[PDB]
Design a protein around this motif. Structure first.
Motif, PDB file in Angstrom:
ATOM      1  N   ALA A   2      66.722  24.242  95.468  1.00  0.00           N
ATOM      2  CA  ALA A   2      67.989  23.573  95.126  1.00  0.00           C
ATOM      3  C   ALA A   2      68.688  22.956  96.352  1.00  0.00           C
ATOM      4  O   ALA A   2      69.244  21.843  96.281  1.00  0.00           O
ATOM      5  N   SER A   3      68.647  23.683  97.470  1.00  0.00           N
ATOM      6  CA  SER A   3      69.314  23.251  98.704  1.00  0.00           C
ATOM      7  C   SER A   3      68.674  21.994  99.262  1.00  0.00           C
ATOM      8  O   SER A   3      69.377  21.028  99.588  1.00  0.00           O
ATOM      9  N   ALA A   7      69.989  17.620  99.689  1.00  0.00           N
ATOM     10  CA  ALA A   7      69.808  16.714 100.839  1.00  0.00           C
ATOM     11  C   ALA A   7      68.974  15.457 100.500  1.00  0.00           C
ATOM     12  O   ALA A   7      69.343  14.345 100.839  1.00  0.00           O
ATOM     13  N   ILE A   8      67.854  15.665  99.819  1.00  0.00           N
ATOM     14  CA  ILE A   8      66.958  14.583  99.408  1.00  0.00           C
ATOM     15  C   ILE A   8      67.658  13.613  98.441  1.00  0.00           C
ATOM     16  O   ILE A   8      67.517  12.395  98.568  1.00  0.00           O
ATOM     17  N   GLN A   9      68.436  14.136  97.493  1.00  0.00           N
ATOM     18  CA  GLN A   9      69.181  13.264  96.567  1.00  0.00           C
ATOM     19  C   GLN A   9      70.294  12.514  97.270  1.00  0.00           C
ATOM     20  O   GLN A   9      70.509  11.355  97.017  1.00  0.00           O
ATOM     21  N   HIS A  10      71.025  13.185  98.139  1.00  0.00           N
ATOM     22  CA  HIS A  10      72.037  12.485  98.901  1.00  0.00           C
ATOM     23  C   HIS A  10      71.416  11.317  99.648  1.00  0.00           C
ATOM     24  O   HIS A  10      71.950  10.212  99.598  1.00  0.00           O
ATOM     25  N   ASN A 191      61.925   5.484 102.146  1.00  0.00           N
ATOM     26  CA  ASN A 191      61.828   5.912 100.745  1.00  0.00           C
ATOM     27  C   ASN A 191      60.552   6.712 100.428  1.00  0.00           C
ATOM     28  O   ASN A 191      60.593   7.713  99.708  1.00  0.00           O
ATOM     29  N   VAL A 192      59.430   6.286 100.987  1.00  0.00           N
ATOM     30  CA  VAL A 192      58.138   6.912 100.699  1.00  0.00           C
ATOM     31  C   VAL A 192      58.091   8.369 101.144  1.00  0.00           C
ATOM     32  O   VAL A 192      57.501   9.230 100.465  1.00  0.00           O
ATOM     33  N   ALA A 193      58.720   8.637 102.287  1.00  0.00           N
ATOM     34  CA  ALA A 193      58.809   9.988 102.820  1.00  0.00           C
ATOM     35  C   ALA A 193      59.568  10.892 101.859  1.00  0.00           C
ATOM     36  O   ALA A 193      59.094  11.978 101.507  1.00  0.00           O
ATOM     37  N   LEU A 194      60.750  10.439 101.441  1.00  0.00           N
ATOM     38  CA  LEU A 194      61.607  11.230 100.577  1.00  0.00           C
ATOM     39  C   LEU A 194      60.888  11.647  99.313  1.00  0.00           C
ATOM     40  O   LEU A 194      60.791  12.830  99.021  1.00  0.00           O
ATOM     41  N   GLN A 195      60.376  10.668  98.576  1.00  0.00           N
ATOM     42  CA  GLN A 195      59.528  10.937  97.410  1.00  0.00           C
ATOM     43  C   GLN A 195      58.135  11.408  97.838  1.00  0.00           C
ATOM     44  O   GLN A 195      57.759  12.543  97.584  1.00  0.00           O
TER      45      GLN A 195
END
Ligand SMILES: [Zn+2]
Ligand SMILES: [Zn+2]
Ligand SMILES: [Zn+2]
Ligand SMILES: [Zn+2]
Ligand SMILES: [Zn+2]
Ligand SMILES: [Zn+2]
Length: 195
Positions: A2-3, A7-10, A191-195
């Motif tokens: 969840a934590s 961060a990833i969504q922000h 973007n690619v890193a995040l996803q």
């Protein structure tokens, strides 16, 4: 889990907004650059026709076509996108240029600012760049259709200096576009890193 997701969504929401800001900006910049190229082409043709003029009824015909060019350049100087004139700064109540080259636009530039802080001038006061372009074309057209040959050599040089002004702006605008394109590529890689 969840934590990490906070961060990833922000970050992903910042990236989305930046992607829209880059898309919006590239549209205004593309339109700007295309308008400038259209002016460059017009002044080029004006230069060519004025060389013909310098090299009775036929001087007047050249004068006529320069008049079409004057009209096209005034159309181009009055280009409008997203509610504002790209060469009329911060006011859109009136067309920013008249056929005489008089500026009636806004006094100040309009700045746009990307989500990450990067700022550029999106809509600019174009009087210094385009008023003399138009005034010169107008004196060119009149000189020709009144058979006034002595006026033409001076105006040839005036148009060359005006055109150099348009070329330098085209280059500055190309550079801002290149920056935007680098920002896009950086964001895509992020973007690619995040996803
Ligand atoms: Zn957040
Ligand atoms: Zn539009
Ligand atoms: Zn109004
Ligand atoms: Zn600022
Ligand atoms: Zn380009
Ligand atoms: Zn692109």
């Amino acid at each position: 889990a969840a934590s990490k997701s906070f961060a990833i969504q922000h970050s992903l929401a910042n990236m989305e907004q930046m992607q829209k800001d880059i898309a919006d900006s590239k549209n205004v910049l593309t339109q700007t650059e295309n308008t400038l190229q259209g002016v460059l082409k017009s002044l080029t043709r004006a230069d060519q026709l004025t060389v013909q003029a310098l090299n009775e009824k036929e001087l007047q015909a050249i004068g006529v076509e320069i008049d079409q060019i004057l009209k096209q350049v005034v159309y181009l100087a009055n280009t409008k996108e997203q509610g504002r004139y790209i060469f009329g700064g911060d006011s859109a109540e009136n067309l920013p240029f008249t056929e005489d080259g008089t500026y009636q636009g806004g006094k100040n530039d309009v700045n746009w600012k990307l989500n990450d802080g990067y700022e550029f001038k999106a809509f600019r006061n174009g009087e210094a760049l385009l008023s003399p372009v138009i005034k010169t074309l107008k004196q060119m057209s009149e000189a020709m259709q009144n058979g006034d040959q002595k006026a033409l050599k001076p105006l040839l040089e005036e148009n060359k200096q005006n055109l150099d002004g348009i070329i330098n702006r085209t280059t500055e605008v190309g550079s801002t576009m290149n920056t935007m394109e680098t920002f896009k590529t950086i964001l895509s890689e992020q973007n690619v890193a995040l996803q």
